[PDB]
Enzyme design. Structure first.
Site, short mmCIF file in Angstrom:
data_model
loop_
_atom_site.label_atom_id
_atom_site.label_comp_id
_atom_site.label_asym_id
_atom_site.label_seq_id
_atom_site.Cartn_x
_atom_site.Cartn_y
_atom_site.Cartn_z
NE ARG A 193 -1.52 0.72 3.76
CZ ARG A 193 -1.78 0.69 5.06
NH1 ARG A 193 -2.94 1.14 5.52
NH2 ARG A 193 -0.87 0.21 5.91
CG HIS A 238 -8.11 1.48 10.29
ND1 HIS A 238 -7.21 0.58 10.80
CD2 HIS A 238 -8.21 2.47 11.21
CE1 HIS A 238 -6.78 1.00 11.98
NE2 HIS A 238 -7.38 2.14 12.25
CG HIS A 255 -9.99 8.62 14.24
ND1 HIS A 255 -10.65 8.03 13.18
CD2 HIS A 255 -9.31 7.63 14.86
CE1 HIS A 255 -10.38 6.74 13.16
NE2 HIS A 255 -9.58 6.47 14.17
CD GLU A 256 -6.63 8.22 17.41
OE1 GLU A 256 -6.91 7.20 18.08
OE2 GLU A 256 -6.26 8.18 16.22
NE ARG A 309 -9.88 6.16 7.90
CZ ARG A 309 -9.02 5.85 8.86
NH1 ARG A 309 -8.03 5.00 8.61
NH2 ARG A 309 -9.14 6.38 10.07
CG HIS A 367 -11.32 4.90 18.21
ND1 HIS A 367 -12.17 4.04 17.55
CD2 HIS A 367 -10.23 5.04 17.42
CE1 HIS A 367 -11.63 3.69 16.40
NE2 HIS A 367 -10.45 4.28 16.30
CG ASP A 369 -12.65 7.68 9.65
OD1 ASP A 369 -11.68 7.98 10.38
OD2 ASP A 369 -12.58 6.81 8.76
CD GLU A 386 -10.49 2.52 13.52
OE1 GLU A 386 -10.29 3.72 13.26
OE2 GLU A 386 -10.00 1.95 14.52
#
Ligand SMILES: CC(C)C[C@H](NP(=O)(O)O[C@@H]1O[C@@H](C)[C@H](O)[C@@H](O)[C@H]1O)C(=O)N[C@@H](Cc1c[nH]c2ccccc12)C(=O)O
Ligand SMILES: CC(C)C[C@H](NP(=O)(O)O[C@@H]1O[C@@H](C)[C@H](O)[C@@H](O)[C@H]1O)C(=O)N[C@@H](Cc1c[nH]c2ccccc12)C(=O)O
Ligand SMILES: *[C@@H]1O[C@H](CO)[C@@H](O[C@@H]2O[C@H](CO)[C@@H](O)[C@H](O)[C@H]2NC(C)=O)[C@H](O)[C@H]1NC(C)=O
Ligand SMILES: *[C@@H]1O[C@H](CO)[C@@H](O[C@@H]2O[C@H](CO)[C@@H](O)[C@H](O)[C@H]2NC(C)=O)[C@H](O)[C@H]1NC(C)=O
Ligand SMILES: *[C@@H]1O[C@H](CO)[C@@H](O[C@@H]2O[C@H](CO)[C@@H](O)[C@H](O)[C@H]2NC(C)=O)[C@H](O)[C@H]1NC(C)=O
Ligand SMILES: *[C@@H]1O[C@H](CO)[C@@H](O[C@@H]2O[C@H](CO)[C@@H](O)[C@H](O)[C@H]2NC(C)=O)[C@H](O)[C@H]1NC(C)=O
Ligand SMILES: *[C@@H]1O[C@H](CO)[C@@H](O)[C@H](O)[C@H]1NC(C)=O
Ligand SMILES: *[C@@H]1O[C@H](CO)[C@@H](O)[C@H](O)[C@H]1NC(C)=O
Ligand SMILES: [Zn+2]
Ligand SMILES: [Zn+2]
EC number: 3.4.24.11
Lengths: 696, 696
Positions: free
Chosen positions: A49, A658, A530-531, A664, A534, A597, A593
């Site tokens: 990737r 993810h 984002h974090e 995303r 979670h 996002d 995830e």
């Protein structure tokens, strides 16, 4: 009203270069924002990737290479040990000259590999037991076979450690691969060939005859065994509920309900657990409390293992041990994994030796390497600024609660309580730079040598397990960092209720105090959101402010959470990925995830809005005709520019929690009204569906 | 009065990102202009050298990948063949499965490789001769060993082709390497280990026994033999005078002067030359005129070749053949070159396959690939503008002759005359786009297979050699281009007296319609001046307006040329390069390129001044506090931004006729009064020595 700083110009050119202005923003914004990027960047032969993230990580590895290859000179012992280890790693000349001898040496220590023994049954078969065999691989070499045994945090008591029992991972990336049909058929053939190939190589180095049909028979028998074990494992979709996974019981209770029969004899869980724990001088009584994550697997495990001989079981266990060690031997042994690796990642070549070695040294000495990184590439003036980004976004989350209509007052207040309780980690732990003595003593018992690379990595396996196993009776050492500083990533810990932002991720395009605020909120700002989110996704919401698995949700609010998030399960589940041959994403396993996002992007945007209301708007960027509302979303998307190899595309759909960067971007912006207002997208245009999902 | 376009934005940003504004321009303009470049563009793991030039070819390779990777239904045969060739090249799976078989099957054609043969004397010894062995490697594969034979242009008669005899190149980069001490030590060990490693691989695949010691004995003799040959070759410093190199004599006179004894038998030059030329059915009589470039080398060859057996000689010759093919076989054969590649280039891995394949197809079907490239990436609108720039700089050169006081009047008139006769080539030959029939015919005899890459490259070697040998009785075709269009470079031909600027170099930072004039003159302007000046350097000045090697200089002016140019020999020879371990540039071998650099930039700046004088000033660039006089020199320097791996720095300093970009910038600007005026450099600052060199 146009920015003319040196910084703004470099910034603008970057935005311009990556985007394709000839694309329609409302048909495919990924193509609009990253079209130029995609047209420019080819996936490296050694990469499965390639993306912005991968580039930042590749650049970090270079920095690591620079500091690790540097002549010692006035280095503390901790740094010297890191450099010595690295030097031993990059010296392929010494490694090639040793052939496979380092592996052949310790094979008796793991009760051997039957297929590579002329007569295994009399050499090991008398003193053999599954208890000692599984335990040895676990406690000395960190290899978890048949039964995954590890010491971890008590889910319902985050201050304590406790034994966990779970189903193990497999040779192949996931249980789906063991269907061995269609897109998996290629993986299975290379996999079995991998087995046979290594078996021949080892036998040839021992000076033993080669019956290739027989080697092939035993390996197909191994594959036959692992197919059943894979089939016996519980699907990942049925393991996303932490409350359901938690089964606390005593060792005696484990003995009672999850009995196993090996070689006509009953399996002894007490013998097994204590074979592991005796290595750290801890006795495990029958009244020991244990958490069992996979009770259904252990049940299904009984009819399977009872059908196989000791030889068959050991053949699998030793193989699982050897397949992760062949790439640490001579060039001949490395090549045996090529066809296997190529099937799983699409990479025609393993990464450069210095890259793997930098990562290996970083992964095993994260504090020592972190020290070198931040001194070489991280500015200290970054802390209070990230501090400033986080305080805003934390506050946005709390304020957003009043607007969210799917929660009742009591649940909102408890959600707020957890939000206020979130603790933050930024950059690096100070004492890895200011406290030489502590850092030196962290690695004190490691004593590396350049001509014995294999001895070094064997030492590390033993060191890692021993260090971890000893924690069983210790209380959890919170503030302990959960990641090295030399990492391009960010994390949320549900057990510690903390968010962590290591030095490696605090750089453009995510962050710079020397780039615009519009760009910052869309980058590191979205990441911070984002974090935090979670902590409130389908997993995190199950843990309270203290990190304990405790329900603070009303039944109604919980059901509403599931109702709201179900929208995202279908949405991302409906996405078909051309790189994976039209196959759809796992809307369930990526849910957390995707929630992260979608919540994060809205929070970063709200916080940016509050900033503008406080100091006023920013001057525009030159050479690009977009307002700062548009630039926010443009930078957000360019953060996720990227592409995948078809082989890895298929892999990551089943193994990566993810979504790929492409979706995303598409998924998040589709649910964004503010996005459609910025680029004036017509109703029911692809980027502006009438039905929009919303959680946080 | 500041440009605001998107074009100006990325133009300015590039300049800004590459420079280091904290460095003092008058202390080190390389650090000033390229300091930021160095931090931003770390050498890729597959690159031995990295630079702006290198960056542009890679981006060009990407374009070639796009236009080669996808078959299209309307593709003419020439394009189909180019694409078939590319597809054959990138199919590593098909290549890997064949091992070394394509080479093993082919080896008899070159009289085998004795060390890897079961019984070489029995199988090949009976029919072996040095004449035929050297000839076969030459006429089928273009591999020049012991004695270089090629059909080329007559130096003194540019309309004719004629046979040349010269000293061959070596397995190592230059004769200096064969001291095998100090900076050459590692190269020699890896070189011999490379031989041994390949011998083992081929023998293993043939099912023959491996005698490590016996192989080592034979391969050290190969090195021993090549050491003597290397020592016999004439230094590059003694080969820069075209007048001294030209020795015309008959084949009969060659037999008389340069007799050789091999295996106790006399070497026949008639046999040798006819073994080669019979491949295209041309007989070479004893009265045939031949050009001998290295008579001293051929004489020194006499006592060397007598001391060695046919096995020794063939072990060397076939090794020279095998070493360039091993990377075109399966991975195991590829990896055998690893230590050798690192010694010469410092690289840890071979460059990407698709990059190599794109380049390979480009190299062998330059017209077909040139066609695809210009249609996809080249703006034809560029040509007329480039025409105008050439005219300006041509005229500047002629006018500049009055200022030059070291030439008498009649040599100036002769210089002007040649300047007027220079013919230009811009972009691409029109036929490759406008004439499908001509393009298709060129590759008529070529027929590639999808799954036989090695077979395809052998076909190309034979075809390429055959095509050139056939020209011996034909006149030289002047319109025939000397480069493909998909090339990032520029050329001057002494023999044709022409300057060539392929499409690949007609791009930023050299030239763009969306680029400031200062940048264009500092870029492509300097390049145009460079190529023109090549017609008048220490080599070029020996050729007249029609490309014939004749003396048109008066004795005094010739003497003065040597005096003026002698300054630059000392200047660049005194430059020490830290990347090359403090080795000094070769002032003699780089003289020609240094002369062209210094002349071209002076011509380009004067032409730019004239343009600004007639058309006025241009708008300034944002974020850069420099005027356009300064932007001229900034862009010129950034053309040469780059860095070297230490192993290749050592390599290039002994093989490259160019100075490293580092010293092309420093050297040319030290001699530039105009540069120092622009940046107001104090007299006797490093960039402004009071003693300056001047030729053109
Ligand atoms: C920036 C922020 C969104 C980072 C975010 N990390 P997060 O999802 O919180 O954490 C993820 O799951 C945890 C269970 C693991 O422990 C982590 O290592 C990570 O895999 C992420 O999407 N990580 C992805 C994307 C990514 C991060 N760094 C990368 C470097 C290269 C390529 C992709 C990435 C990943 O780890 O894959
Ligand atoms: C003025 C410059 C724009 C063009 C200029 N080519 P020029 O020197 O006229 O010619 C070059 O060297 C001659 C000796 C050979 O005969 C030619 O075939 C050519 O290789 C040059 O300096 N070439 C260098 C720099 C360079 C050109 N293309 C590159 C690609 C990558 C790296 C460097 C280069 C080289 O060949 O090295
Ligand atoms: C990398 O490993 C090689 C192989 O072990 C080392 O080469 C040896 O170095 C020792 C050191 O004195 C010598 O005694 C041996 O004779 C060498 N053997 C060979 C085959 O080279 C090499 O030194 C190592 N590299 C570094 C930087 O230590
Ligand atoms: C687990 O069981 C094994 C046997 O299955 C135990 O090994 C025995 O240990 C005793 C005393 O240490 C020896 O006298 C025996 O000879 C051993 N037998 C074998 C077959 O090795 C082992 O001690 C047990 N471990 C624990 C922690 O109870
Ligand atoms: C390189 O070749 C030259 C001759 O071409 C060698 O020089 C000879 O060296 C021997 C031994 O000292 C003398 O007896 C001869 O008189 C020399 N001849 C000439 C013409 O000088 C030289 O030894 C060779 N060097 C190497 C390293 O092979
Ligand atoms: C080829 O050999 C001939 C004969 O030795 C060389 O011609 C002689 O050159 C010397 C000095 O250059 C004169 O003194 C003789 O009178 C010449 N003899 C004849 C018959 O011409 C000739 O120079 C040699 N050529 C090369 C390139 O080595
Ligand atoms: C998987 O196990 C179940 C029982 O647990 C059995 O019914 C089923 O046939 C197995 N599937 C395969 C493919 O072995
Ligand atoms: C590569 O070659 C193999 C074997 O010859 C063949 O099966 C495969 O289809 C080829 N792949 C491509 C992309 O041509
Ligand atoms: Zn995440
Ligand atoms: Zn040149």
């Amino acid at each position: 009203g146009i920015c003319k700083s040196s910084d703004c110009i470099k910034s603008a050119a970057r935005l311009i270069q990556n985007m394709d202005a000839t694309a329609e923003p409302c048909t495919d914004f990924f193509k609009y924002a990253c079209g130029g990027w995609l047209k420019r960047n080819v996936i490296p032969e050694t990469s499965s990737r390639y993306s912005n993230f991968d580039i930042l990580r590749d650049e970090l590895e270079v920095i690591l290479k620079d500091v690790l290859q540097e002549p010692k000179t006035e280095d503390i012992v901790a740094v010297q040990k890191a450099k010595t280890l690295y030097r031993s790693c990059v010296n392929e000349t010494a490694i090639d000259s040793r052939g496979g001898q380092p592996l052949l040496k310790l094979l008796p220590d793991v009760y051997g590999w039957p297929v590579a023994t002329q007569n295994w049954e009399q050499t090991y078969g008398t003193s053999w037991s599954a208890e000692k065999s599984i335990a040895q691989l676990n406690s000395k070499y960190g290899k978890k076979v048949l039964i995954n045994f590890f010491v971890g945090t008590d889910d319902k008591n985050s201050m304590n450690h406790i034994i966990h029992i779970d189903q193990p991972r497999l040779g192949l990336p996931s249980r789906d691969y063991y269907e061995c049909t269609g897109i998996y058929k290629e993986a299975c053939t290379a996999y079995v060939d991998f087995m046979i190939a290594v078996a021949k190589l080892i036998r040839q180095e021992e000076g033993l005859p080669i019956d290739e049909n027989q080697i092939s028979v035993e390996m197909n028998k191994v594959m036959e065994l692992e197919k059943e074990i894979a089939n016996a494992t519980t699907k990942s979709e049925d393991r996303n509920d932490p409350m359901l996974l938690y089964n606390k019981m005593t060792l005696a209770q484990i003995q009672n309900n999850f009995s196993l029969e090996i070689n006509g004899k009953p399996f002894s869980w007490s013998n097994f657990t204590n074979e592991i724990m005796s290595t750290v001088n801890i006795n495990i009584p029958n009244e020991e409390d244990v958490v069992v994550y996979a009770p259904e697997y252990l049940i299904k495990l009984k009819p399977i293992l009872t059908k196989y001989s000791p030889r068959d079981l050991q053949n699998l266990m030793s193989w699982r041990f050897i397949m992760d060690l062949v790439s640490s031997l001579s060039r001949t042994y490395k090549d045996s994994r090529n066809a296997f690796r190529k099937a799983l990642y699409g990479t025609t070549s393993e990464s450069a030796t210095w890259r793997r070695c930098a990562n290996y040294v970083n992964g095993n000495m994260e504090n020592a390497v972190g020290r070198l990184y931040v001194e070489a590439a991280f500015a200290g003036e970054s802390k209070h600024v990230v501090e400033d980004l986080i305080a805003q976004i934390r506050e946005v989350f709390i304020q957003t609660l009043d607007d969210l209509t799917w929660m009742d007052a009591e649940t909102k207040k408890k959600a707020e309580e957890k939000a206020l309780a979130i603790k933050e980690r930024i950059g690096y732990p100070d004492d890895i730079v200011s406290n030489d003595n502590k850092l030196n003593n962290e690695y004190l018992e490691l004593n590396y040598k350049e001509d014995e690379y294999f001895e070094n990595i064997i030492q590390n396996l033993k060191f890692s397990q021993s260090k971890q196993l000893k924690k069983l009776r210790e209380k959890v050492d919170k503030d302990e960092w959960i990641t090295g500083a030399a990492i391009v990533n960010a994390f949320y810990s549900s057990g510690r209720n903390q968010i962590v932002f290591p030095a490696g991720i605090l750089q453009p395009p995510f962050f710079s105090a020397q780039q615009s605020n519009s760009l910052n909120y869309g980058g590191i700002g979205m990441v911070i959101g984002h974090e935090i989110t979670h902590g409130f996704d389908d997993n995190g919401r199950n843990f309270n402010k203290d990190g304990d698995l405790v329900d603070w949700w009303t039944q109604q609010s919980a059901n509403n959470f599931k109702e709201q998030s179900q929208c995202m399960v279908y949405q991302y589940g409906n996405f078909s990925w051309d790189l994976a041959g039209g196959q759809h994403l796992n809307g369930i396993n990526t849910l957390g995830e995707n929630i992260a996002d979608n919540g994060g992007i809205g929070q970063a945007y709200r916080a940016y809005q509050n900033y503008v209301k406080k100091n006023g708007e920013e001057k525009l960027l030159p050479g690009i005709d977009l307002n700062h509302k548009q630039l926010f979303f443009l930078n957000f998307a360019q953060v996720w520019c990227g592409t995948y190899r078809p082989e890895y595309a298929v892999n990551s759909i089943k193994t990566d929690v993810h979504s790929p960067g492409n979706f995303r971007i598409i998924g998040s912006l589709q649910n964004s009204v503010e996005f459609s207002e910025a680029f004036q997208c017509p109703k029911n245009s692809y980027m502006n569906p009438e039905k929009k999902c919303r959680v946080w």
